[PDB]
Design a protein around this ligand. Structure first.
Ligand SMILES: O=C(Nc1ccc2c(c1)Oc1ncccc1C(=O)N2c1ccncc1)Nc1ccc(Cl)c(C(F)(F)F)c1
Lengths: 265, 336
């Protein structure tokens, strides 16, 4: 519950709502090896590797959200070859569990979850076998804190969204779908560009469209720059168009070879 | 493999080492498990301000260390301690925390007010200001849903000479943990969740100590600590059913029923205790403290309401500097 209503003063807002232009600028570095469409698919894919990871450890969604954000933050600044994303993702999950008060993941449990989930659910991408031990996780943890400048408290659309559907007054008919659409925004850069209240409002709006409810009254009563939330709507619809044309299990492996790799001494 | 080399060396030619950025001899404290704390000065002439360098005892990043770093990293209130940076040595995986350095604290300040002889009463104005800043800091925390859970004079720091002269800073130097002199009664009766109210009880304990210079619930040396409860009852009296109706709901109420007979504390009350220590029962200060020191936790007033008390509207008025403009006689911290 800590710092729940401090977001306007948080380091999240004060140091991690980045400008799209800087994001795209620093992203030019990986674009020499990869295409724009492939990059998205790559970061979609590691969101799915983190989701899968936290699912196996029975971690609550916001622990898994914070870990996904940790990942997006790191590679928003540094290249895909800086640290192997296969090491980064379990490290993010590991840092989130501690930070998120959930509880240190058993050292045996973290490596076993890594190992099993690539084997079981991602065997099309990795035929190798998970290669890293607790030694590497702890080394990578230090690079992770350093890069984030130790901003570890992260805000997500789930809390504002509950307030919205509850205070709008049909909580049970809208929230399951809207919650899923919040889940799905983590396939995108939204968590880096907009406050979670705006994200949450755009996710509510799509859920109403899907269920055909007309909440125009309610929305126009809110004092929020609609032109901003409408950008998010377009991203989320672009998200669903992307999903249709993406066959991760048939595409990811060749994209994984394309992606730049760490160089030795 | 795992990490690219060029990225490692660049980070290893740009990163900052605490050993090269600070002059740190002034070992303020050493501790079985909390590492070492030094009184440090920037090696650049940029600022003359003092800092505390804490090296955490364990290697790696503790969970206790994670939550502390993440919390302190979001807290901005003049009356809560400030974390200025974190230094991570990747070679020896050690962690360094840098805080703005507090020369004083309430434990040492109160102790000095009994080392000079019988106790010398603390300046009333200092006591008001001390409590006010403690109520501002805990309120801020509580309003961010942050519970301190170990409020006691040693945790209240006071800034010394400098631009925050005499300003209370609330800390938690045994955050890795989580005398029962400041523990609220419900904790002693087996309560299983920490509360905003438990903090308020500890604030009142501190308040009584500032007024009387003694620890109100001081006691010789299981969730249930019979002898500590006996000190509360000896000071406060035993609570009536009307005073704490849900006390029956406590896990240890049966033990309390078996170990105590309320008739023992017939002549016991806060009025009666506070009278012996020259605090008058009609004062504004006594009434407030009675509001802080309430047995039933949900009858205990909140930090925001206490700041709203007429006590702080009476004369003298609280100052940003608890030391008014006068000279600070308390000794500075010794090195080891
Ligand atoms: O308070 C901390 N850390 C901290 C604070 C002070 C010092 C410190 C660590 O290092 C030490 N370690 C062990 C023993 C002594 C010291 C010491 O001498 N310290 C010091 C002394 C004088 N000047 C500056 C610093 N963390 C924290 C966690 C959670 C919360 Cl909620 C809160 C709060 F919100 F309640 F404030 C605070």
């Amino acid at each position: 519950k800590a710092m729940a209503g401090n977001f306007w003063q948080s380091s999240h807002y004060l140091q991690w709502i980045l400008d799209k232009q800087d994001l795209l600028k620093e992203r030019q570095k990986d674009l020499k090896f990869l295409s724009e469409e492939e990059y998205w698919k790559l970061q979609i894919f590691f969101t799915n590797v983190i989701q899968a990871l936290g699912e196996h450890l029975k971690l609550r969604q916001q622990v898994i959200a914070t870990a996904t954000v940790y990942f997006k933050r790191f590679y928003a600044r540094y290249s895909l070859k800086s640290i192997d994303p296969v090491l980064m993702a379990p490290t993010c999950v590991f840092l989130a569990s501690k930070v998120e008060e959930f509880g240190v993941v058993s050292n045996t449990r973290l490596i076993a979850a890594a190992t099993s989930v690539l084997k079981t659910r991602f065997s099309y991408a990795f035929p190798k076998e998970f290669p890293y031990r607790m030694n590497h996780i702890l080394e990578c943890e230090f690079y992770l804190l350093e890069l984030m400048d130790c901003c570890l408290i992260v805000y997500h659309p789930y809390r504002p969204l509950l307030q919205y559907v509850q205070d709008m007054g049909q909580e049970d008919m809208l929230l399951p779908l809207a919650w899923r659409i919040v889940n799905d925004t983590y396939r995108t850069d939204l968590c880096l560009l907009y406050p979670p209240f705006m994200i949450a409002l755009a996710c509510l709006h799509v859920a109403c469209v899907v269920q055909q409810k007309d909440a125009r009254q309610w929305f126009a009563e809110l004092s929020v720059d609609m032109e901003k939330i409408l950008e998010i709507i377009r991203v989320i619809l672009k998200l669903y168009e992307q999903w249709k044309n993406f066959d991760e299990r048939k595409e990811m492996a060749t994209i994984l070879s394309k992606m730049p790799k760490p160089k030795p001494p | 493999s795992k990490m690219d080399y060029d990225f490692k060396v660049k980070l290893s030619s740009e990163r900052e080492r605490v050993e090269d950025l600070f002059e740190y001899e002034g070992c303020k404290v050493g501790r079985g498990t909390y590492g070492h704390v030094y009184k440090a000065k920037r090696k650049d002439g940029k600022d003359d301000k003092d800092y505390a360098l804490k090296q955490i005892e364990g290697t790696g990043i503790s969970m206790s260390a994670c939550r502390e770093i993440a919390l302190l990293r979001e807290l901005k209130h003049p009356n809560v301690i400030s974390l200025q940076k974190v230094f991570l040595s990747h070679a020896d995986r050690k962690v360094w925390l840098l805080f703005d350095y507090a020369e004083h604290d309430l434990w040492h300040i109160i102790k000095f007010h009994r080392a000079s002889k019988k106790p010398v009463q603390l300046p009333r104005g200092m006591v008001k200001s001390l409590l006010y800043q403690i109520l501002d800091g805990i309120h801020y925390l509580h309003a961010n849903w942050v519970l301190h859970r170990d409020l006691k004079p040693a945790n209240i720091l006071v800034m010394g000479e400098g631009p925050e002269r005499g300003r209370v800073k609330i800390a938690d130097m045994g955050f890795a943990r989580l005398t029962f002199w400041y523990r609220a009664p419900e904790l002693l009766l087996g309560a299983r969740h920490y509360t905003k109210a438990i903090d308020i009880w500890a604030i009142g304990c501190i308040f009584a100590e500032l007024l009387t210079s003694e620890p109100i619930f001081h006691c010789r040396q299981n969730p249930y600590h019979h002898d500590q409860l006996d000190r509360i009852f000896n000071v406060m009296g035993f609570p009536a059913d009307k005073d704490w109706e849900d006390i029956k709901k406590m896990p240890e109420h049966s033990t309390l029923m078996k170990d105590f007979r309320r008739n023992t504390y017939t002549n016991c009350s806060l009025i009666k205790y506070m009278e012996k220590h020259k605090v008058k029962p009609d004062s504004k200060a006594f009434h407030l403290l009675q509001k802080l020191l309430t047995m039933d936790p949900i009858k205990r007033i909140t930090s925001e309401q206490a700041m709203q008390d007429p006590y702080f509207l009476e004369d003298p008025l609280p100052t940003s500097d608890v030391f008014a403009g006068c000279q600070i006689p308390y000794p500075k911290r010794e090195f080891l």
